Every structure is written in structure tokens, then in C-alpha cells.
């Protein structure tokens, strides 16, 4: 008595089961992509190889990430690629001493941004790395549009990106009424994106949220069989008289 698939395949099995199978293709593709994160709490070794001391011989090495923690505050507030580091440290940086646990935390702030795509000011608990990234991206909108899904790690940021994409795809009067030139210039400022409306809706949505949206889409209450029977009778009468 044993199962047919491993334990780390039940997720994909359920995804391919039923309601999760009717979901769009781009959403499933983006979910199955699972790209690697950007280095933050560790120096990424550029060259794949490196000559270690004590022996002039090359050796293969890699860069393993740090199991970082993402509290609810990180998902509620636009945080960079950092978070709460849960680990352990010695006393005076020597294994000959005692071992004690330690938990680091980032530096939070409270700034006021202003996005041009949404035209509204927000009060988000932004950090220093996020501010530096926004400044380097030449705009908060550019920083939000550049960071992919798993790189931004934050539900609020994903929702903001989805809203910006929907606004850029709609291209309808809403930004500034009685000001078409300003709206046209704002749209021209961001033209290297604009995801279609069909694919722009399934951007940043979670698994449960996606399932709920799919259920609400293909709901359609049961149609009374009286209309179906009437249509069948009409088709029969047509086949009998006309053809």
C-alpha cells in the first residue's frame, strides 16, 4: 500500500484537478515559473568558480539564499527584498564560545509617495532599500513595474502593480477629466508595458482569490429546462416543415 505520486506533487495534482484546471493559461504559467530571488543579505559571487586557498585548484560554488521571514507587515507595506532574518550567532564570533539565537529586523519609516498612473498620495511604511530602488528606477511607477512577482514580495505592491497595468491597458478617460493632453503624455511616459486586459486581470492574484474570481466568472445559475425543451421542439418543427 503506497501512493502513486510523491508528497511534493499533490499541489500540482490539485492544480490540474478540476476548478484549478479551468483557470487561464498565463496564470498557471506564472505560478509554475518560480524564479529565483535577488541577492540582498549575502554577497553574490559573480564568477561561478573560485580558486580556494591552500591549493591552486578551481572549485565550483553557488550562492544559497537565506531563509527569510515575511511577516504580515511586509505584505501590508511595500518592503524591499529584505525582511526578518531568523538565525543564530555565537558570542564573540567564535565556535569555541556558546551558541545563542538572534533575530534581526529592518529599518522602517513613514514617507508619502505620489504615483502618476494612479494620481493619489499614499502613506506606506517604506524602508531605505525600497526608497533607494525607487530613486534608481527614476520613479515609483517604474520601480513597481520592473520588480516581477516574486521579487517584490508584497500583496499591496502586487495590487498596486495590477491597478497600474489595468489603468495603462484601459486607456480611457479617468486620470484627469478635461485634460486629454496630460493623459496622453502620462501614457506615453510608460509604453514599455501595457499588458492586455485579458492577462492584466490575473496579475498578483493569489490562489484562493483566483479560484474565487473564476467561480464568480463562470457562475451562471442553472437555466430552466423549459427553454431547452422549447428550443428542441422548435428545431423539430423546423426539420419537419422546412427541411
Amino acid at each position: 500500500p503506497l501512493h502513486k505520486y510523491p508528497v511534493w506533487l499533490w499541489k500540482r495534482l490539485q492544480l490540474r484537478e478540476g476548478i484549478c484546471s479551468r483557470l487561464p493559461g498565463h496564470y498557471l504559467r506564472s505560478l509554475e515559473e518560480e524564479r529565483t530571488p535577488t541577492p540582498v543579505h549575502y554577497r553574490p559571487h559573480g564568477a561561478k568558480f573560485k580558486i580556494n586557498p591552500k591549493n591552486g585548484q578551481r572549485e565550483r560554488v553557488e550562492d544559497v539564499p537565506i531563509p527569510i521571514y515575511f511577516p504580515p507587515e511586509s505584505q501590508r507595506g511595500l518592503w524591499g527584498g529584505e525582511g526578518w532574518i531568523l538565525g543564530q550567532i555565537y558570542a564573540n564570533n567564535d565556535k569555541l564560545s556558546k551558541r545563542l539565537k538572534k533575530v534581526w529586523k529592518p529599518q522602517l519609516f513613514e514617507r508619502e509617495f505620489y504615483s502618476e498612473i494612479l494620481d493619489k498620495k499614499f502613506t506606506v511604511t517604506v524602508t531605505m532599500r525600497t526608497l533607494d530602488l525607487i530613486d534608481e528606477a527614476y520613479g515609483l511607477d517604474f520601480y513597481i513595474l520592473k520588480t516581477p512577482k516574486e521579487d517584490l514580495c508584497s500583496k499591496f505592491g502586487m495590487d498596486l502593480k495590477r491597478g497600474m497595468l489595468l489603468r495603462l491597458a484601459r486607456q480611457d478617460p479617468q486620470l484627469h477629466p478635461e485634460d486629454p493632453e496630460r493623459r496622453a503624455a502620462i501614457y506615453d511616459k510608460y509604453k514599455e508595458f501595457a499588458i492586455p486586459e485579458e492577462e492584466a486581470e490575473w496579475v498578483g492574484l493569489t490562489l484562493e482569490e483566483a479560484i474565487e474570481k473564476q467561480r464568480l466568472l463562470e457562475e451562471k445559475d442553472p437555466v430552466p429546462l423549459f427553454k431547452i425543451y422549447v428550443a428542441e421542439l422548435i428545431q423539430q418543427l423546423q426539420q419537419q416543415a422546412l427541411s
Partner: peptide
């Protein structure tokens, strides 16, 4: 924000 190195 805090760079960290691995042990062992």
C-alpha cells in the same frame, strides 16, 4: 538591509 554571511 543587513548583509549576512553563512557559517560551516
Amino acid at each position: 538591509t543587513v548583509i549576512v554571511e553563512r557559517w560551516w
